[PDB]
Design an enzyme around this catalytic site. Structure first.
Site, PDB file in Angstrom:
ATOM      1  N   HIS A   1       4.093 -20.679  -7.995  1.00 43.14           N
ATOM      2  CA  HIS A   1       5.452 -20.225  -7.676  1.00 43.14           C
ATOM      3  C   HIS A   1       6.515 -21.260  -7.997  1.00 43.14           C
ATOM      4  O   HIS A   1       7.674 -20.899  -8.121  1.00 43.14           O
ATOM      5  CB  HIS A   1       5.578 -19.847  -6.205  1.00 43.14           C
ATOM      6  CG  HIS A   1       5.269 -18.421  -5.895  1.00 43.14           C
ATOM      7  ND1 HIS A   1       5.929 -17.389  -6.523  1.00 43.14           N
ATOM      8  CD2 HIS A   1       4.430 -17.906  -4.975  1.00 43.14           C
ATOM      9  CE1 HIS A   1       5.434 -16.280  -6.005  1.00 43.14           C
ATOM     10  NE2 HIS A   1       4.519 -16.544  -5.078  1.00 43.14           N
TER      11      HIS A   1
ATOM     12  N   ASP B   1       9.948  -5.959   4.365  1.00 43.97           N
ATOM     13  CA  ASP B   1       8.751  -6.314   5.125  1.00 43.97           C
ATOM     14  C   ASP B   1       7.776  -5.135   5.262  1.00 43.97           C
ATOM     15  O   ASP B   1       6.575  -5.356   5.310  1.00 43.97           O
ATOM     16  CB  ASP B   1       9.112  -6.858   6.512  1.00 43.97           C
ATOM     17  CG  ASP B   1       9.763  -8.224   6.502  1.00 43.97           C
ATOM     18  OD1 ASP B   1       9.641  -8.930   5.480  1.00 43.97           O
ATOM     19  OD2 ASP B   1      10.399  -8.593   7.529  1.00 43.97           O
TER      20      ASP B   1
ATOM     21  N   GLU C   1       5.347 -12.191  -8.086  1.00 45.88           N
ATOM     22  CA  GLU C   1       3.954 -12.236  -7.688  1.00 45.88           C
ATOM     23  C   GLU C   1       2.980 -11.967  -8.763  1.00 45.88           C
ATOM     24  O   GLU C   1       1.937 -12.600  -8.777  1.00 45.88           O
ATOM     25  CB  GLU C   1       3.695 -11.301  -6.516  1.00 45.88           C
ATOM     26  CG  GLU C   1       4.557 -11.637  -5.326  1.00 45.88           C
ATOM     27  CD  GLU C   1       4.432 -13.048  -4.792  1.00 45.88           C
ATOM     28  OE1 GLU C   1       3.377 -13.683  -5.019  1.00 45.88           O
ATOM     29  OE2 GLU C   1       5.392 -13.516  -4.141  1.00 45.88           O
TER      30      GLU C   1
ATOM     31  N   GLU D   1       5.904 -20.309  -0.650  1.00 49.85           N
ATOM     32  CA  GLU D   1       6.275 -21.255  -1.682  1.00 49.85           C
ATOM     33  C   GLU D   1       7.659 -21.918  -1.499  1.00 49.85           C
ATOM     34  O   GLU D   1       8.399 -22.075  -2.476  1.00 49.85           O
ATOM     35  CB  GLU D   1       6.195 -20.538  -3.032  1.00 49.85           C
ATOM     36  CG  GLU D   1       7.273 -19.473  -3.229  1.00 49.85           C
ATOM     37  CD  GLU D   1       6.889 -18.053  -2.872  1.00 49.85           C
ATOM     38  OE1 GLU D   1       5.937 -17.871  -2.082  1.00 49.85           O
ATOM     39  OE2 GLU D   1       7.548 -17.118  -3.378  1.00 49.85           O
TER      40      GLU D   1
ATOM     41  N   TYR E   1       1.427  -7.818  -6.327  1.00 48.89           N
ATOM     42  CA  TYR E   1       0.489  -8.877  -6.694  1.00 48.89           C
ATOM     43  C   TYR E   1      -0.535  -8.431  -7.728  1.00 48.89           C
ATOM     44  O   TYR E   1      -0.625  -9.014  -8.799  1.00 48.89           O
ATOM     45  CB  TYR E   1      -0.301  -9.337  -5.453  1.00 48.89           C
ATOM     46  CG  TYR E   1       0.483 -10.126  -4.447  1.00 48.89           C
ATOM     47  CD1 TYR E   1       1.326  -9.493  -3.547  1.00 48.89           C
ATOM     48  CD2 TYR E   1       0.298 -11.493  -4.315  1.00 48.89           C
ATOM     49  CE1 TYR E   1       2.005 -10.206  -2.573  1.00 48.89           C
ATOM     50  CE2 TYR E   1       0.961 -12.216  -3.337  1.00 48.89           C
ATOM     51  CZ  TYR E   1       1.840 -11.570  -2.489  1.00 48.89           C
ATOM     52  OH  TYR E   1       2.504 -12.259  -1.510  1.00 48.89           O
TER      53      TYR E   1
ATOM     54  N   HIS F   1      -1.896 -20.604  -5.990  1.00 47.20           N
ATOM     55  CA  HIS F   1      -0.873 -19.562  -5.988  1.00 47.20           C
ATOM     56  C   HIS F   1       0.491 -20.120  -5.585  1.00 47.20           C
ATOM     57  O   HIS F   1       1.464 -19.872  -6.296  1.00 47.20           O
ATOM     58  CB  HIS F   1      -1.279 -18.429  -5.034  1.00 47.20           C
ATOM     59  CG  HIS F   1      -0.348 -17.254  -5.043  1.00 47.20           C
ATOM     60  ND1 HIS F   1      -0.520 -16.202  -5.929  1.00 47.20           N
ATOM     61  CD2 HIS F   1       0.705 -16.981  -4.245  1.00 47.20           C
ATOM     62  CE1 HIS F   1       0.415 -15.324  -5.627  1.00 47.20           C
ATOM     63  NE2 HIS F   1       1.180 -15.755  -4.628  1.00 47.20           N
ATOM     64  N   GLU F   2       0.582 -20.881  -4.466  1.00 51.23           N
ATOM     65  CA  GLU F   2       1.872 -21.438  -4.057  1.00 51.23           C
ATOM     66  C   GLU F   2       2.393 -22.488  -5.032  1.00 51.23           C
ATOM     67  O   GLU F   2       3.610 -22.608  -5.217  1.00 51.23           O
ATOM     68  CB  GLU F   2       1.855 -21.961  -2.619  1.00 51.23           C
ATOM     69  CG  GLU F   2       1.258 -21.021  -1.597  1.00 51.23           C
ATOM     70  CD  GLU F   2       1.810 -19.613  -1.578  1.00 51.23           C
ATOM     71  OE1 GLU F   2       3.004 -19.435  -1.908  1.00 51.23           O
ATOM     72  OE2 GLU F   2       1.050 -18.683  -1.223  1.00 51.23           O
TER      73      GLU F   2
HETATM   74  N1  LIG Z   1       5.879 -14.950  -1.226  1.00 51.93           N
HETATM   75  C1  LIG Z   1       4.750 -15.466  -0.425  1.00 51.93           C
HETATM   76  C2  LIG Z   1       3.487 -15.526  -1.321  1.00 51.93           C
HETATM   77  O1  LIG Z   1       3.336 -16.881  -1.760  1.00 51.93           O
HETATM   78  C3  LIG Z   1       4.442 -14.615   0.823  1.00 51.93           C
HETATM   79  N2  LIG Z   1       5.574 -13.877   1.358  1.00 51.93           N
HETATM   80  C4  LIG Z   1       6.240 -14.169   2.444  1.00 51.93           C
HETATM   81  C5  LIG Z   1       7.165 -13.230   2.662  1.00 51.93           C
HETATM   82  C6  LIG Z   1       6.957 -12.274   1.583  1.00 51.93           C
HETATM   83  C7  LIG Z   1       7.669 -10.996   1.269  1.00 51.93           C
HETATM   84  C8  LIG Z   1       7.918 -10.748  -0.076  1.00 51.93           C
HETATM   85  C9  LIG Z   1       8.569  -9.588  -0.458  1.00 51.93           C
HETATM   86  C10 LIG Z   1       8.867  -8.628   0.502  1.00 51.93           C
HETATM   87  O2  LIG Z   1       9.498  -7.466   0.107  1.00 51.93           O
HETATM   88  C11 LIG Z   1       8.913  -6.692  -0.879  1.00 51.93           C
HETATM   89  N3  LIG Z   1       7.634  -6.304  -0.775  1.00 51.93           N
HETATM   90  C12 LIG Z   1       7.068  -5.523  -1.722  1.00 51.93           C
HETATM   91  C13 LIG Z   1       7.801  -5.057  -2.818  1.00 51.93           C
HETATM   92  C14 LIG Z   1       7.141  -4.161  -3.827  1.00 51.93           C
HETATM   93  C15 LIG Z   1       6.178  -3.284  -3.539  1.00 51.93           C
HETATM   94  C16 LIG Z   1       5.808  -2.660  -4.813  1.00 51.93           C
HETATM   95  N4  LIG Z   1       6.591  -3.184  -5.670  1.00 51.93           N
HETATM   96  N5  LIG Z   1       7.398  -4.096  -5.094  1.00 51.93           N
HETATM   97  C17 LIG Z   1       9.126  -5.460  -2.949  1.00 51.93           C
HETATM   98  C18 LIG Z   1       9.682  -6.282  -1.968  1.00 51.93           C
HETATM   99  F1  LIG Z   1      10.962  -6.651  -2.041  1.00 51.93           F
HETATM  100  C19 LIG Z   1       8.599  -8.854   1.854  1.00 51.93           C
HETATM  101  C20 LIG Z   1       7.988 -10.043   2.243  1.00 51.93           C
HETATM  102  N6  LIG Z   1       6.010 -12.705   0.869  1.00 51.93           N
HETATM  103 ZN   LIG Z   2       3.151 -15.326  -3.901  1.00 53.03          ZN
END
Ligand SMILES: N[C@H](CO)Cn1ccc(-c2ccc(Oc3ncc(-c4ccn[nH]4)cc3F)cc2)n1
Ligand SMILES: [Zn+2]
Ligand SMILES: [Yb+3]
Ligand SMILES: [Yb+3]
Length: 607
Positions: free
Chosen positions: A296, A372, A315, A268, A380, A292-293
């Site tokens: 955002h 990551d 999300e 997004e 989500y 979805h995008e």
């Molecule tokens: N955003 C678009 C969708 O359009 C797609 N996208 C691209 C890059 C990312 C991304 C987002 C968050 C990230 O870090 C995290 N992942 C999970 C949690 C978590 C788990 C349970 N609770 N929270 C917390 C986080 F900080 C890593 C990669 N997403």
């Molecule tokens: Zn998203």
């Protein structure tokens, strides 16, 4: 406190604006230039600040025309190295200074993927794209890499004159490079304050086609026509999203179709959404990613999570808005079908990680955890499930959509935490605080596993998928010839995908059943990446050797992690394909996106 950042927190100083002047070097695979940060002090007598950097070479730091002292600390793994800058003059509270940093990215920048001409559609020009979410903006430029700080930005990007540069900003003109007549400078302006994780860049032989009053579709020449048709509902989705969240404040809503190695379904980036080419199914069936995008542009980009611990806010609300957009276009039963399928995806994530795993928690503690690695369907779907459960508890979709609009208005241009969301929800629903006080907040927000309460879902579109899936699962060899192509005649592509998803939750099925499925359904001929993915996972988990080359091809011809990561894991878990999956990873590793390579390496246990 943002434990993913090594920079000074927003309580010390705040970046108000970034003016980026850079040049894209394809021979050196480097981005060289200056990042001019307009920083505002939040404290009295501020004499230094710290920025985030990751694999950046720093030439010098200029403040008020003079070079100042700076020091780079020891690297902190995926967090990078802190960069302390000595200010030449102490600042009072609210004073601003411009800090001009001359820097150069590493070719190994975790934020970028450099593509040779052979890795593109046209084969004549190289390509570059960024992916800053979550903490990769530090691998591009020195910054306070935290969603708690929002800034505006202007940019001037020098690229070879034959290529086009695009950013998550409004195009603000172009001219030949004065320093180099073989290069062209593309100018950009982002007037709406954004978190730096939303800064995006793409350089390639790009073309555009207009698909709506405020939308152009960008991609290499070969994919323009297909993309224009695929994403033709973009404007209608923007009008629905505007009705649900208020005015679209970004001006333009463009879409960029990236090379197949793009690690996500969509990103997004404001003004320029980045999408995977695996969305090009030919029938608009994967358009919910655009819905979805688009969503955002309100939840995530206007109302941002203060830290990555509170990412579920981004999300969960986006998936909630996305399902309302698709519900408005195709009906309420379709919103329930997608919501129910989403619960099934949450079941899968909770099963894969384990019901006690801290990554299945809604609100996580990302100290010492690479974002990551924590990334999955949990923020989500668990986020969505909470909002869908609250919607049913509080009086229905119309009442809950009133809260979402007030929530967006209340926190526009701000970064907030789960407690900020909760106080506002309690405040907005003051006449229903008794109902809100029945929610098990500790389990919903802080406990691992599946949520304590499962919402109610309409089963009209799901019944057929469960019925066919159960017919296959309960079938014996003497029931195989009762299956026919007519079993799928009243199933939409979404229902075919839900049929495969239900069947995959009970995989493996006997090899003869899988062979019969190909005989009557010809699933090998389906190009739709979502259906193809689940079918090949079903084949591999059911131990069909014939599916090994098909699965190896899908895992390497595209790089969207949602597909590439489980395909590689399935192939590594199957003894017949294990050596092949490992060898294929090793030979593709150098040509892969830096984050997809790291994560596929971890899943496969290959260093
Ligand atoms: N955003 C678009 C969708 O359009 C797609 N996208 C691209 C890059 C990312 C991304 C987002 C968050 C990230 O870090 C995290 N992942 C999970 C949690 C978590 C788990 C349970 N609770 N929270 C917390 C986080 F900080 C890593 C990669 N997403
Ligand atoms: Zn998203
Ligand atoms: Yb202008
Ligand atoms: Yb309160």
């Amino acid at each position: 406190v943002d434990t993913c950042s090594l920079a000074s927190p927003a309580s010390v100083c705040r970046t108000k604006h970034l003016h980026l002047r850079c040049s894209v070097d394809f021979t050196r695979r480097t981005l060289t230039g200056t990042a001019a940060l307009t920083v505002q002090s939040q404290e009295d007598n501020l004499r230094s600040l710290v920025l985030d950097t990751k694999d950046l070479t720093i030439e010098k730091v200029v403040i008020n025309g003079q070079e100042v002292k700076y020091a780079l600390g020891e690297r902190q793994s995926y967090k990078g190295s802190p960069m302390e800058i000595s200010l030449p003059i102490a600042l009072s509270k609210n004073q601003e200074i411009v800090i001009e940093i001359s820097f150069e990215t590493s070719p190994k920048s975790s934020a970028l993927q450099w593509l040779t001409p052979e890795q593109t559609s046209g084969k004549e020009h190289p390509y570059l794209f960024s992916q800053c979410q979550a903490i990769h903006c530090r691998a591009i430029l020195p910054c306070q890499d935290t969603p708690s700080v929002k800034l505006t930005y202007t940019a001037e990007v020098s690229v070879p004159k034959e290529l086009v540069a695009l950013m998550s900003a409004i195009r603000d003109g172009e001219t030949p490079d004065p320093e180099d007549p073989s290069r062209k400078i593309y100018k950009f302006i982002q007037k709406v304050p954004i978190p730096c994780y939303l800064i995006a860049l793409v350089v390639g032989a790009l073309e555009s086609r207009q698909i709506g009053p405020r939308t152009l579709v960008w991609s290499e020449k070969e994919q323009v026509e297909k993309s224009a048709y695929e994403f033709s509902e973009t404007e209608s989705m923007l009008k629905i999203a505007e009705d649900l969240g208020g005015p679209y404040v970004w001006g333009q809503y463009d879409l960029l179709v990236l090379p197949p190695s793009f690690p996500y379904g969509g990103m997004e980036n404001p003004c320029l959404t980045f999408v995977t080419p695996t969305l090009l199914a030919g029938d608009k069936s994967l358009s919910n990613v655009i819905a979805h995008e688009i969503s955002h542009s309100w939840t995530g980009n206007l109302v941002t999570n203060k830290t990555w611990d509170h990412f579920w806010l981004n999300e969960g609300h986006t998936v909630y808005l996305e399902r309302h957009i698709c519900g408005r276009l195709f009906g309420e039963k379709f919103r329930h079908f997608n919501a129910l399928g989403g619960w099934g995806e949450l079941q899968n994530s909770v099963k894969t990680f384990g019901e006690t795993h801290p990554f299945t928690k809604l609100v996580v503690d990302l100290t010492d955890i690479d974002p990551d690695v924590a990334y999955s369907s949990v923020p989500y779907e668990k986020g969505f499930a909470l909002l869908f459960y609250l919607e049913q508890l509080l009086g229905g979709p119309e009442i809950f959509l009133g809260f979402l609009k007030a929530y967006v208005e209340k926190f526009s241009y701000k970064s907030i935490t789960t407690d900020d969301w909760k106080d506002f929800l309690y405040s907005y629903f003051k006449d229903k605080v008794d109902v809100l006080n029945q929610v098990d907040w500790n389990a919903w927000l802080y406990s691992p596993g599946l949520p304590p309460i499962k919402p109610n879902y309409d089963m009209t579109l799901t019944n057929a998928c469960i019925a066919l899936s159960q017919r296959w699962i309960t079938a014996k060899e003497d029931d195989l010839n009762s299956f026919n192509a007519t079993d799928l005649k009243d199933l939409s592509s979404h229902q075919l995908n839900e049929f495969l998803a239900q069947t995959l939750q009970r995989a493996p099925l006997p090899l003869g059943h899988i062979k019969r499925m190909q005989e009557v359904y010809n699933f090998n001929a389906i190009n739709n990446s979502e259906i193809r993915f689940r079918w090949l996972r079903l084949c591999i988990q059911s131990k069909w050797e014939d599916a090994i080359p098909l699965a190896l091809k899908m895992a390497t011809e595209q790089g969207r992690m949602k597909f590439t990561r489980p395909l590689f894991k399935d192939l590594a878990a199957f003894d017949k394909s294990h050596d092949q999956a490992v060898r294929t990873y090793q030979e593709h590793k150098a040509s892969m996106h830096p984050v997809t390579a790291m994560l596929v390496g971890k899943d496969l246990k290959v260093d």
